[PDB]
């Protein structure tokens, strides 16, 4: 009698305890739920003045799992919250324990830059594949030590941030496959992609993919993913044709025309 489950802390892939996860199914990469997190180990705090959000994955957990789960985490109590991801809203497990509050909600990216993490593998699937705004703010020595192609299963790119000149990109967790440009970056890069993505006004957000470039596996990559989306518009014409500048430097031939020919089917706005 499966349950969803959605973790936040050290439970997360890649994190120390997840491997008492075991075999359970990740349903979803990309979750939130409405809450914050504080670092106490992690923990969420549920009040009625909450106005932001807990990033976390979700995961198909057996009776075992949530037996294990229960016994490890003493101290511990659960219970289920809906969980906003990609593909509609979902209800959930989660556990939490009744500290600093970690602003952006997020573990990883908390542990990103508390950390000073450095390198970042940065995953890139639109704009950003091209140099030449890189160029511009000085920044482009930063991006000249590409690990190059990088494929990304379970997601496609789609243009869901509606701007009033056209949309821009975004990758949506909803079962397609997709490419970028895996880039290796200095610490030190990672303000000016913050800017960039506007994670500061909520435009996008910071997030974590696993990805293949090179043959070889890279995990925890950094990308930014929207977080208001809308339905799909054209992008404006000079936002295009950077993308299309770095998709054919970079990407495949198939994917490349696949990706142009989304992006000139789509409405205009």
Same mark, same amino acid.
């Given at each position: 009698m499966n349950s969803l489950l959605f973790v936040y $802390?050290? =439970?997360? #892939?890649?994190? #120390?305890?997840?491997? =008492? =996860? %075991?075999? &359970? %199914?990740?349903?979803?990469?990309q979750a939130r739920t409405k809450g914050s997190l504080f670092a106490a180990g992690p923990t969420v705090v549920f009040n009625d003045e909450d106005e932001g959000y807990i990033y976390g994955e979700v995961y198909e957990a057996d009776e075992l799992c949530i037996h294990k789960l229960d016994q490890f985490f003493q101290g511990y109590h659960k219970q289920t919250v809906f969980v906003e991801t990609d593909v509609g809203i979902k209800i959930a497990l989660i556990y939490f324990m009744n500290f600093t509050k970690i &602003? !952006? $909600?997020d573990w990883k990216e908390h542990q990103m830059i508390s950390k000073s993490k450095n390198p970042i593998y940065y995953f890139a699937? $639109? !704009?950003?594949?091209?140099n030449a705004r890189f160029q511009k703010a000085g920044v482009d020595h930063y991006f000249q030590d590409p690990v190059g192609r990088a494929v990304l299963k379970g997601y496609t790119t789609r243009f869901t941030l509606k701007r009033e000149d056209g949309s821009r990109a975004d990758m949506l967790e909803d079962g397609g496959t997709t490419e970028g440009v895996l880039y290796r970056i200095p610490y030190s890069a990672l303000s000016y992609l913050y800017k960039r993505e506007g994670v500061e006004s909520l435009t996008y957000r910071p997030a974590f993919v696993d990805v293949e470039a090179g043959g070889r596996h890279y995990k925890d990559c950094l990308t930014f993913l929207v977080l208001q989306k809308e339905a799909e518009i054209a992008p404006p014409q000079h936002y295009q044709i950077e993308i299309e500048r770095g998709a054919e430097l970079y990407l495949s031939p198939e994917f490349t025309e696949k990706l142009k020919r989304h992006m000139n089917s789509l409405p205009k706005g």
């Open positions: $802390g050290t =439970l997360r #892939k890649h994190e #120390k305890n997840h491997h =008492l =996860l %075991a075999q &359970s %199914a990740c349903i979803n990469e &602003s !952006s $909600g699937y $639109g !704009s950003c594949m091209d």
